Amino acid sequence: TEIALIGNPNSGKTSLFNLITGHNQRVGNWPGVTVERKSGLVKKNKDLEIQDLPGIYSMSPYSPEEKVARDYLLSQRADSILNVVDATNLERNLYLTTQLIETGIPVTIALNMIDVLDGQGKKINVDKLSYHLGVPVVATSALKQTGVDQVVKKAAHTTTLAFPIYDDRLEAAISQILEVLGNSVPQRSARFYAIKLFEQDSLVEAELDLSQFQRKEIEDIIRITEEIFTEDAESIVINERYAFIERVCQMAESHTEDF
Numbered sequence: 164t165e166i167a168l169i170g171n172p173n174s175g176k177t178s179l180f181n182l183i184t185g186h187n188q189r190v191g192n193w194p195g196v197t198v199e200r201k202s203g204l205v206k207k208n209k210d211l212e213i214q215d216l217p218g219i220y221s222m223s224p225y226s227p228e229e230k231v232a233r234d235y236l237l238s239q240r241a242d243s244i245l246n247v248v249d250a251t252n253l254e255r256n257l258y259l260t261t262q263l264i265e266t267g268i269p270v271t272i273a274l275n276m277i278d279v280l281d282g283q284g285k286k287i288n289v290d291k292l293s294y295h296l297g298v299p300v301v302a303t304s305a306l307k308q309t310g311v312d313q314v315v316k317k318a319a320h321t322t323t324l325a326f327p328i329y330d331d332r333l334e335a336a337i338s339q340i341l342e343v344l345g346n347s348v349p350q351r352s353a354r355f356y357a358i359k360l361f362e363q364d365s366l367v368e369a370e371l372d373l374s375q376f377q378r379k380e381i382e383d384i385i386r387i388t389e390e391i392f393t394e395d396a397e398s399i400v401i402n403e404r405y406a407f408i409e410r411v412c413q414m415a416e417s418h419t420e421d422f
């Protein structure tokens with residue numbers, strides 16, 4: 164079982180990797196430490212091979228190091244994404260998370276640096292956060308060495324799909340683009356690609372070898388949807404992503420009992 168450590172730079176990926184595998188890979192207090200993939204067997208379960216990757220802020224990234232993690236993800240090798248999330252910068256970290264879920268590779272969140280959040284006198288409702296994100300979440304600290312074995316066990320158990328649901332009208336366009344795509348994208352990641360094409364992402368547009376006919380249909384779908392939303396395609400998706408994350412964070416900061 165192949166488990167990939169994916170998350171923003173400086174979120175504690177390698178720190179967790181080292182704890183999990185017994186390795187002593189490079190860890191530092193600045194973003195951009197890890198620059199290539201490192202594999203290692205999980206000590207407590209030798210059937211699992213975990214992968215340390217350079218940090219990434221989104222799936223439309225701006226450095227060669229970020230490209231290593233993106234290419235790795237879209238190569239379809241991973242069985243599990245162990246998404247390492249900085250608990251003290253939750254909203255910013257969840258941007259990538261929502262794109263990761265869209266790849267259809269099951270996501271498990273290591274809600275890391277929980278000890279820092281503790282010292283800030285702050286709290287995250289782990290169960291609400293997991294419920295609204297539709298993924299398992301385990302609070303971890305690579306510093307205090309807590310939750311680490313638990314989150315790996317959980318990630319492993321996901322390899323044996325709910326996505327963030329946006330505005331109906333955007334969902335209608337994503338479904339239309341999915342139809343146009345057919346088998347021209349890997350089935351598991353289809354939604355990730357459909358959304359990126361809606362956004363007119365340069366990388367995805369160059370990567371996929373779509374026919375003129377597919378491209379014209381997608382163009383027409385985008386134009387129709389922009390007129391429906393009275394907003395440009397790029398903004399539609401970014402805003403939907405932001406609104407989803409905002410709702411999620413408000414749930415995550417809510418410690419009231421649900422009756």
Ligand SMILES: CNc1ccccc1C(=O)O[C@H]1C(=O)[C@H](n2cnc3c(=O)[nH]c(N)nc32)O[C@@H]1COP(=O)(O)OP(=O)(O)NP(=O)(O)O
Binds near residue numbers: 174178189195216
């Ligand atoms: C006391 N440690 C720190 C507390 C706050 C900010 C930085 C540090 C620090 O001395 O450095 C690393 C570490 O110990 C610290 N750290 C990691 N996990 C925890 C954690 O769970 N709690 C605390 N307090 N600090 C943690 O964060 C820093 C980043 O860790 P990684 O290099 O593992 O991050 P990455 O995701 O692999 N970056 P990249 O390769 O994608 O560029």
Ligand SMILES: [Mg+2]
Binds near residue numbers: 176177215216
């Ligand atoms: Mg690292």
